[PDB]
Write a protein that binds this ligand. Structure first.
Ligand SMILES: [Ca+2]
Ligand SMILES: [Ca+2]
Ligand SMILES: [Zn+2]
Length: 860
RNA sequence: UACAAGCGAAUGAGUCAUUCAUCCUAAGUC
RNA sequence: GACUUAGGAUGAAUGACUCAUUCGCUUGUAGA
């Protein structure tokens, strides 16, 4: 392996490098750059309070103007940035700003009472202890709230919120009838207030509904709340507490960035409340919208972080823009591979970029080597465009860091001031985040997680993902720049490109005057003036003439440039079709018999000079094989030397228009006028027969005999009741079987569809086990003996009792107890049904039913 | 959408194993 | 005409894993 799909290896991630490099705690006066965070909601819902995120570095003015949408539950919330100036923070204001982020991001995410009551009875506050280790100088933010009240502009930081948060922090550092901790409050209205508990952490959301209940009120193995806090914490309540608070508690982050299931069921549940006495509660004077808006931040900052790695790569290729200035949101989905769940995932750019690279390499090797023959050029073109050579060029330029295999679990998300309750420790060995390449880190082994991240940044890469990412970057620079834009990217990676000497070939051909008209009639049908008469004449001579000039080198250039034209034509018109259907639509146009069908339709084949009489009989056979229309389809496939003519035309006029490429598509558009469209697309018939028979569940066997010049083949299919046959003979025999397949398929369309023994004579092999065995043996047995597929029916069971006991090697507790009864339709007999009993898996229930029907099938 | 862990089902992707293909560019043997 | 290998762009059936979002149940939680 050298870049295939089985070799897997580590690669290190890359930090943002525009996020932070240092901090102003030495100079004791620090200046920041501000970036607004406003939220606009589609559903009316609730008005989200704004934020601002600070840095030391500024942004690249395309990241600083971004619009994104967030899919919360059913509502859709938009988000934007729109930067606002600068800001200068004094020392004590910088100390108040740190406790805010260390209090809220440790409130809903993690715990801020680090101390075990069970291990050793000592509890801390997490802010008394030695912090700044968590910051780990590589990530720096200081997100701050903003008062959204604006006359024209609101650059305020809402300092009452920061002072209240710092006041309750220093309070917990020290540690009619109404009573909180620290605040008496107002008995009148206490809705939408925000509290903290003192005996535990977990700052709470909206308190509401002061209910007619005491602290001595029935719990629902405890009688009242008072004995519960007397027992579980050893805390007596200072007041009898005729009021009592119920409140909504705080969940975690949910990856509210991609609509997984809203637009494709989520049966929502009522909200689980909690109760606490009010004298265990200390009051914060912060608003509630700033508490509802915390959940929106670890979804927006992963976009804003993934766009910084986009703009860092964009400024790393370029030394001189021609006019190409592409969006940073197109670098982002040119690198993210398909394992990351997102909208667009770089395969669609890759299908374009491979053909761009093939075209540039083919015309470059044509123009550099005028003396070298066709097969020797295709080997050097095989050396450059290969999928192992790009792996040598990609990881040498350190592009492997940005590859984003990813899953984006949002639960970890290492913040600046977060304690991060979910660590996965480094068992990888080395401590630097980037790995050097060595066969210790290469592997060919399953049962390992692809894309899962270590703390330092390591992850396994499929190594096809790093090899085709060089092709997608070429594609991205083509769709937003021009062809001259994607010449600089091939100049970056080290692929040699030399488009200057395109004069000398036509020069040495047009000084071939008198050594070594009928060419007039060819230019009527091409609809082109043609600057050089000799170049057009050169792309005609078969090889029968035995002249020094050849027409297969221009064919080598022409198939490449025509592949690139057809694959850039399909890329713009159909925006939604992936690479699996686009490859089929491209194979419909560059089919080699399709080009033979075009060269006869425009009556261009008669200009071909040839002396091989073996070929001449095939032309006479092929043109008489045409039928009347609708178009005239051929009876046989015919020659490949006739279809190479229209490919050789695409190379000659390319040189005569001097490497211009919009002119050649102006010529071949009227010649190719019935271009294919995905509804009218007709698969080659044997492939469609195979993909039809595998879909329904019917099996067929094939027979082939290349007896003489005439080759015939028969296909026998097995339906549920009747067998079907198809005959077919052709000289090649590769397609003759496809013609027999089409003869059977038009018939099959008329029925409106588009160790142990067997019963007596057939013989089952030795039985297999381990979760997939007998279904595999039964499937291979149904493939050999032409039977249809069995259909499995199950019966789902549920037990609320906390044991469903099924035997085996282990005890195997469960909750399922599945059992399944199947039917096996055997031709010209009756259907047979039987059931298994045990083993609470769907698949293992199917397996037990297979074993039971094979034991019943023996005694019959 | 209180949190963590385990068992089960549905949907969608990725890799692997076995056996059959479609399309183009080259090469060798009989 | 047969077969094999090298290079790039792909698809279908059956089976095992892994990840992603949601749902039912169970033990535990300085959760109530
Ligand atoms: Ca590829
Ligand atoms: Ca050809
Ligand atoms: Zn590691």
């Amino acid at each position: 392996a050298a870049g295939s799909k089985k070799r897997k290896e580590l690669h290190g991630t890359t930090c943002a490098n525009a996020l932070s490099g240092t901090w102003g705690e030495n100079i004791d006066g620090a200046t920041f750059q501000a970036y607004k965070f406003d939220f606009c909601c589609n559903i009316s819902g609730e008005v989200y309070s704004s934020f601002s995120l600070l840095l030391e570095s500024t942004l690249a003015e395309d990241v600083g103007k971004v619009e994104m949408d967030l899919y919360l539950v059913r509502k859709l919330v938009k988000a934007s940035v729109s930067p606002c100036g600068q800001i200068r923070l004094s020392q004590e204001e910088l100390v108040k700003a740190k406790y805010f982020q260390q209090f809220f991001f440790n409130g809903m995410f993690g715990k801020l009472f680090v101390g075990s009551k069970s291990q050793g009875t000592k509890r801390e506050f997490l802010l008394q202890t030695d912090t700044s280790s968590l910051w780990h100088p590589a990530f720096m933010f200081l997100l701050l709230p903003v008062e959204t009240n604006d006359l024209a502009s609101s650059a305020t930081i809402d300092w009452s919120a920061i002072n209240s948060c710092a006041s309750i922090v220093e309070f917990l550092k020290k540690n009619n009838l109404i009573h909180f901790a620290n605040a008496s409050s107002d008995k009148n209205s206490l809705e939408e207030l925000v509290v903290i508990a003192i005996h535990t952490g977990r700052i709470y959301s909206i308190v509401e509904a002061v209910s007619d209940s005491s602290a001595m009120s029935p719990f629902e193995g405890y009688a009242t709340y008072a004995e519960y806090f007397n027992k579980k914490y050893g805390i007596v309540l200072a007041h009898p507490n005729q009021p009592l608070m119920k409140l909504k508690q705080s969940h975690h982050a949910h990856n509210l960035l991609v609509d997984f299931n809203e637009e494709m069921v989520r049966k929502r549940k009522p909200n689980i409340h909690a109760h606490l006495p009010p004298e265990l509660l200390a009051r914060i004077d912060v608003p509630r919208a700033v508490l509802k808006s915390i959940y929106l931040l670890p979804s927006v900052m992963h976009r804003l972080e993934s766009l910084m790695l986009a703009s860092q790569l964009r400024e790393e290729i370029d030394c001189s823009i021609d006019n190409f200035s592409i969006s940073s949101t197109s670098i982002l989905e040119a690198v993210t591979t398909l394992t990351c769940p997102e909208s667009f995932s770089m395969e669609r750019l890759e299908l374009l970029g491979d053909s761009v690279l093939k075209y540039v390499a083919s015309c470059h090797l044509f123009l550099k080597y005028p003396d070298k023959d066709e097969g020797q050029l295709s080997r050097q073109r095989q050396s450059i465009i290969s999928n192992s050579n790009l792996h040598r060029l990609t990881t040498s330029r350190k592009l492997q860091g940005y590859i984003r295999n990813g899953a984006f679990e949002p639960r970890r998300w290492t913040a600046p001031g977060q304690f991060s309750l979910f660590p996965v420790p480094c068992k990888c060995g080395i401590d630097t985040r980037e790995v050097p390449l060595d066969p210790k880190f290469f592997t060919e082994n399953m049962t390992i997680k692809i894309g899962k991240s270590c703390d330092m940044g390591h992850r396994w890469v499929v190594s096809k993902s790093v090899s085709d990412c060089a092709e997608a970057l070429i594609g991205a620079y083509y769709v937003s720049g021009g062809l001259s834009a994607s010449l600089h990217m091939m100049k970056w990676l080290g692929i040699d490109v030399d488009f200057d000497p395109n004069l000398v070939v036509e020069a040495i051909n047009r000084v071939s005057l008198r050594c070594y008209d009928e060419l007039i009639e060819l230019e009527r049908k091409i609809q082109h003036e043609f600057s050089a008469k000799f170049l057009l004449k050169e792309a005609i001579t078969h090889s029968s003439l035995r002249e020094s000039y050849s027409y297969e080198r221009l064919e080598f250039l022409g198939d490449s440039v025509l592949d690139f034209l057809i694959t850039r034509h399909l890329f713009n018109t159909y925006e939604q079709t992936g690479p699996g259907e686009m490859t089929d639509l491209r194979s419909a146009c560059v089919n080699n018999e399709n080009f033979a069908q075009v060269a006869v339709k425009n009556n261009l084949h008669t200009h071909l000079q040839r002396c091989a009489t073996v070929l001449e009989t095939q032309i006479n056979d092929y043109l008489m094989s045409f039928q009347k229309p609708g178009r005239s389809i051929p009876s046989i496939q015919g020659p490949k030397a006739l279809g190479d003519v229209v490919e050789s035309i695409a190379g000659a006029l390319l040189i005569d228009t001097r490497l211009d490429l919009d002119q050649v598509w102006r010529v071949f558009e009227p010649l190719l006028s019935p271009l294919v469209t995905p509804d009218k697309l007709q698969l080659p018939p044997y492939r469609e027969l195979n993909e039809l028979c595998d879909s329904l569940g019917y099996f067929f066997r094939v027979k082939c005999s290349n007896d003489g010049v005439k080759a015939q083949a028969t296909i026998q299919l097995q339906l549920d009741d009747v067998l079907l046959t198809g005959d077919g003979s052709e000289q090649t025999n590769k397609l003759a079987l496809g013609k027999a397949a089409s003869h059977l398929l038009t018939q099959l369309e008329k029925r409106n569809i588009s160790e142990i023994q067997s019963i007596v004579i057939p013989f089952i092999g030795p039985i297999n086990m381990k979760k997939g065995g007998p279904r595999g043996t039964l499937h291979e047995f149904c493939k050999k003996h032409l039977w249809p597929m069995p259909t499995f029916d199950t019966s789902e069971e549920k037990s609320r009792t906390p044991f469903e006991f099924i035997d085996g090697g282990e005890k195997r507790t469960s909750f399922s107890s599945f059992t399944s009864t199947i039917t096996l339709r055997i031709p010209n007999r009756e259907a047979v049904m039987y059931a298994g009993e045990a083993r609470p898996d769907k698949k293992s229930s199917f397996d037990s039913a297979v074993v039971e029907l094979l034991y019943e099938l023996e005694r019959r």
